[PDB]
């Protein structure tokens, strides 16, 4: 019924998902990597661009003081996640399915 | 719960969302758009007004020190989001049945 | 998820709700007029159920932590109170 | 659905006996009066288990937290605050 | 539906194996012995899925931010690890 889903968005490398209509992910958590190594008083932004949109929406900020945040977000069949951290950012959640077996 | 939705509420500019399709917005997250671009110790209020009712309700506060919060809100029909920040505020979630 | 629901609890005025098949889901509690409250105070928010004389704390508010989210169902009869000098906004949704 | 709540008094673990509690919210009482910069731990023990799980910490700086927890037939909530802690949610 | 919880001891990744049809919903990650950990250090908490050698970060913990809530479903095989000197508690519920 549920499968774990997760991506590491590396610095300077937006993560693009291109799938068929009806593909969906529930994104739950966004976490800053290498907290000890990022510049101490900086805030980083995480963005989502939907479909062919040239402009994104901010989904939240990351910093030493707020180094992860929870969200209740559904992402559809075409999206791109980006951020401006020097560290990786981890976006995790789950897909939801019905299932039947023939044994 | 299968339609990403977001709006950017610009400073001084309430954002009206008018839904006539019987679906709703689930607001999930409220974020300050540019933490660097706000007065350092000030707190900003975010309001929602429902339909043509004149009374608004706070959905939360924002500041450089506390620049986002998660929420679980369903908003049908017509609503208006406003705030008094000098920065843009992003309300993000999904449209659902 | 049926419909937006919200109340403003004014200072010194506990807010009573009575319901029938209706449920209120409280989602968010927010401190009003943050700039005007004393910077070093914490305010307590209570719910009293039915005829109870004493409440349960649902949370604290302060200039430093001026709202909090919750996942609460409130049924037949409840009263929300707090000791802020400003209004407190409790919002969520009603279902049926 | 109905509202469910307990006040766990200082030094007094609170024992609860098909019915299920959803614990939603844990709040520190008398925030202004507890020790500055101290963190208090909240525990749950399930059934007859002698050793518990932490469900969270409370302090002046973080004086409540939300949780999504289902608790079954038999459990005990404890904490080490000098003030009361309020655990609320709903029963199903 | 039932309570589920594990204590991940320092230096000891905790491997969970489940039977077909079981799911763990992780709800809360809490730092133990907050008063004893290094004052200004941040600890990373990881989940490794199935046979993956590398984990995904699920969050950070510190004395200043000593727990976080999460909405995660975990399946057949997963491993939780962290680099704290104290235990970390992952709790939630199991369904079938």
Curated annotation (Swiss-Prot), chain E:
Keywords: Chromatin regulator, Developmental protein, Hydrolase, Nucleus, Repressor, Transcription, Transcription regulation
GO cellular component: nucleolus
Required to repress transcription as annotated region, ranges: 2-5
Keyword DNA-binding tagged: no
Annotated compartments: Nucleus, Nucleolus
Top-rank taxon, per record: Eukaryota
Subcellular location, principal: nucleus
Tissue spec: Confined to stems and flowers with young siliques.
GO biological process, one term: chromatin organization
Keyword Glycosyltransferase applies: no
Molecular function GO terms recorded: hydrolase activity
Other information: HDT4 is not required for the cellular patterning in the root epidermis.
Role, per record: Probably mediates the deacetylation of lysine residues lysine residues on the N-terminal part of the core histones (H2A, H2B, H3 and H4). Histone deacetylation gives a tag for epigenetic repression and plays an important role in transcriptional regulation, cell cycle progression and developmental events.
Family indicated by similarity: Belongs to the histone deacetylase HD2 family.
Protein name: Histone deacetylase HDT4
UniProt lineage: Eukaryota, Viridiplantae, Streptophyta, Embryophyta, Tracheophyta
């Amino acid at each position: 019924m549920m499968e774990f889903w997760g991506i590491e968005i590396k610095p300077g490398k937006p993560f693009k998902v291109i799938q068929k209509d009806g593909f969906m992910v529930h994104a739950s958590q966004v976490t800053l990597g290498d907290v000890e190594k990022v510049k101490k008083d900086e805030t980083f932004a995480v963005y989502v661009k939907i479909g062919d949109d040239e402009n994104g929406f901010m989904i939240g900020n990351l910093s030493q003081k707020f180094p992860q945040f929870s969200i209740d977000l559904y992402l559809g069949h075409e999206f791109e996640i980006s951020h401006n951290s020097t560290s990786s950012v981890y976006l995790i959640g789950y897909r939801t399915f019905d299932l039947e077996h023939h044994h």
